[PDB]
Amino acid sequence: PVKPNYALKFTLAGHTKAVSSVKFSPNGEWLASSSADKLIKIWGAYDGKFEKTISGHKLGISDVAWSSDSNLLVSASDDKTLKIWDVSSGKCLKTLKGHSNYVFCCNFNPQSNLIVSGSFDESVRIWDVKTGKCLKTLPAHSDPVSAVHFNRDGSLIVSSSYDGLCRIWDTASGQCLKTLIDDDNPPVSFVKFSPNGKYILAATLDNTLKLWDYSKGKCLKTYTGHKNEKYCIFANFSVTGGKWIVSGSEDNLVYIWNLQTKEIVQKLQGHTDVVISTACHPTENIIASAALENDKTIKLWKSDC
C-alpha cells in the first residue's frame, strides 16, 4: 500500500468552543472528546452518534485518556484538577488535586492502576487510580509539560515540554533515565511511545515530527511539510493498514506520511481551523481529527488501507 484513501465519513458537532483532544477507546467502540467548553463528550466510533456529555470541570479541558478497559476516562483541566470518570454511568469517581497550574496532559498506564499528568506548573505527577492519591511529584521540566505517556509495560514515562526537552522517567523510582534533544531547541509540543515502546514520536514547534530510537539516543526519522509553530498538536502511529504517521497542522489539514520513507501520502481537507488532535482507531483504518475555536468539530475519516 503506497497511499491510503481516507475520505470524510462523519462530523461530530456539539462542542461550543475549541476541541482540545480526541481519543478512541481501546476496545474501538467509543471516541472521547474534550473542549475549552468544560465538557467531555462520548461518541460512537463507527457511526459518529453522540452518546453523552460528562460535565463537572470548572474550566476548559485540554486532554482526556481512556483506561485499557474502555470503562474509565481521566481528564486534565485548566481548573488544575484531573477527574476520573465512570463512562458508562457518567459519574465522577475521584478528583485528583495537587497541581498548582493548568493540567495539560494525562494518561493511564497500560495496567490502568496509575495515571500520569503534566502541568503548566512544570511537574509530572503519578497517581494511584484506586485511592486518587498522588504517589510522586517529579520536577520534570522548566516550562509547561505538553505531553505524558507510559510505555507498553508501564515501566517508563516519556514527558515533553516547552523547555525543549523530551525526558524518560523510571515509573517505580521517578528517576530521570534520559533527556533527548537533537541540537535544536524549539519547544516540544507532543510525545508518545510507539506501540512496542521501542520508539518515541515527538513534535517540535518548528514544523517537525521526530522519531527517536530512545535506547540508542538517536533520532532515526523526521516527518516534515506540515505547519506547527504555535499549538500542541497530537500525532499518531497508524498501524491497522499501511504504516503511517498522522498529524494535525496549522493550515487546517490532516497530514499522513509513509512511516518508512517519510514522504507525505495524503492531506485531508475539511477543518476550518487548526487541527489540534488526531487519533487512530485500534482495529479499523479510521482517523479522528479535532479543530480549534473557528471549527469546533471532530471528524471521522475512513480508508480501505
Binding site: 510507539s194 512496542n196 521501542k198 520508539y199 532515526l220 504504516k243
Partner: peptide
C-alpha cells in the same frame, strides 16, 4: 531503514 513500531521481534 525499515522499522517495526508494533512487534518486539
Amino acid at each position: 531503514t525499515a522499522i517495526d513500531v508494533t512487534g518486539c521481534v
